[PDB]
């Protein structure tokens, strides 16, 4: 279950930068959290996935109920797969929030000129 | 749907009785539910238990109001095995120990006996 090396693929110039070649070290990192944490008595403590996800859903629903629509922001990283991003968009629709974005995202200019930001 | 809004155990009792009736109907002979006649003691008074040892009830673990008024986590927690055994040992054993093998009970159930007269 440990990664031991990373090698480039001889596709074109067969090259990897520092990140792809060496930053795969975080997979073996022992500081990774493997169980969810919820706030008991004001401190984060381990729990089960079912209870944590139930708490997440109830907290989001409480925020939506008390403060109305468009009151929940989803700030998703840009390293997720296409399916995960689509699922996050679906969930944002389920929460009646259009605030679906990322802190790594810059203001777009190309979609106002050519039509697509690509 | 029949009795109106009641507690859940009433609905469960209705379901069980209806299941027994439906089984009887499927077997061919539909028989309405017949309630057995039990011998019961209604003259009992607390003075009959003045000699029994007084034992405290099992404590109830209830989450703090401030911490529980913000989440949907369960309020009460299940008892422990030791507490469960100590609580179940407080029983007075009111029912007859010979209930499942008493023949007088069987016979008074087999006949429409009116004891009050
Ligand atoms: S048999 Fe036990 S539980 Fe039932 S009424 Fe008597 S003391 Fe209570």
TrEMBL record, chain B:
Residues that hold FAD according to the record: 6, 8
Protein name: Molybdopterin oxidoreductase
Species of the source: Caldicellulosiruptor saccharolyticus (strain ATCC 43494 / DSM 8903 / Tp8T 6331)
Residues annotated for [4Fe-4S] cluster 2 binding in this entry: 91, 94
Transmembrane segments: none
Protein residues bound to [4Fe-4S] cluster 1: 96, 102
């Amino acid at each position: 279950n440990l990664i031991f090396d990373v090698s480039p693929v001889q596709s074109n110039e067969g090259m990897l930068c520092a990140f792809g070649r060496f930053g795969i070290k975080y997979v073996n990192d022992k500081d990774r959290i493997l169980a969810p944490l919820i706030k008991v008595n004001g401190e984060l403590s381990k729990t089960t996935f079912d209870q944590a996800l139930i708490e997440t859903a109830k907290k989001l629903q409480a925020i939506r109920a008390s403060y109305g629509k468009d009151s929940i922001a989803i700030i998703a990283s840009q390293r997720l797969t296409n399916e995960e991003a689509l699922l996050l968009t679906k969930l944002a629709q389920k929460l009646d929030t259009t605030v679906i974005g990322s802190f790594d995202l810059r203001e777009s200019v190309l979609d106002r000129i050519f039509g697509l930001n690509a | 749907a029949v009795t109106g809004p009641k507690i859940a155990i009433e609905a469960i009792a209705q379901g069980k009785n209806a299941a027994r009736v439906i089984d009887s109907y499927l077997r061919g002979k539909l028989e309405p539910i017949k309630e057995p006649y039990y011998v019961k003691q209604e003259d009992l008074t607390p003075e009959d238990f003045k000699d029994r040892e007084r034992k405290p009830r099992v404590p109830l673990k209830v989450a703090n109001a401030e911490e529980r008024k913000n989440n949907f986590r369960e309020i009460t927690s299940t008892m422990t095995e030791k507490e469960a055994i100590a609580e179940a040992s407080r029983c007075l054993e009111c029912g007859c120990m010979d209930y499942f093998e008493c023949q007088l009970y069987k016979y008074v159930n087999q006949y429409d006996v009116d004891p009050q007269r």
